[PDB]
């Protein structure tokens, strides 16, 4: 009986580690990667337009 109990405990621990591994990781990241690719494709407008955003006090 004692031996059987031990094996049951081991199985329980394995299951718990599994649930953790499932909570660690999926399609939302792929969608954000697609939208990110849509955002990267231009930098030339930002390298010449973002320079004028550093000099500007709020309008009065």
């Amino acid at each position: 009986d004692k031996d059987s109990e031990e094996l049951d405990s081991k199985t329980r621990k394995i299951l718990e580690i599994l649930n953790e591994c499932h909570d660690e990781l999926x399609x939302x990241x792929x969608x954000x990667x697609x939208x990110x690719x849509x955002x990267x494709x231009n930098s030339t407008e930002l390298l010449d337009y973002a320079t004028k955003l550093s000099k500007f006090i709020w309008p009065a």
């Binding site: 049951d8 199985t11 394995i14 299951l15 599994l18 591994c21 499932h22 990781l25 999926x26 990241x29 792929x30 990667x33 990110x36 690719x37 990267x40 494709x41 930098s43 030339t44």
Partner: protein, 68 residues
């Protein structure tokens, strides 16, 4: 001397810009590729987790058919 150390510590500047733009484009390509690789790895890990799940339901069926 601090000014001399700073002008000598600035990153390597160039007289041309094609280098910088080229670097930017390359970095973009690397970004796309590494994103795809991430996707693949996530898929594989999902599969493995499915397998060890399967093992666990095997055990649960065992003890369930056992003690009661």
């Amino acid at each position: 001397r601090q000014i001399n150390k700073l002008i000598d510590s600035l990153p390597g500047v160039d007289v041309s810009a094609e280098e910088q733009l080229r670097k930017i484009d390359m970095l973009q390509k690397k970004l796309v590729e590494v994103e795809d690789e991430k996707i693949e790895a996530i898929k594989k890990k999902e599969k493995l987790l499915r397998h060890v799940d399967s093992l666990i339901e095997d055990f649960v069926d065992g003890i369930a058919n056992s003690k009661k």
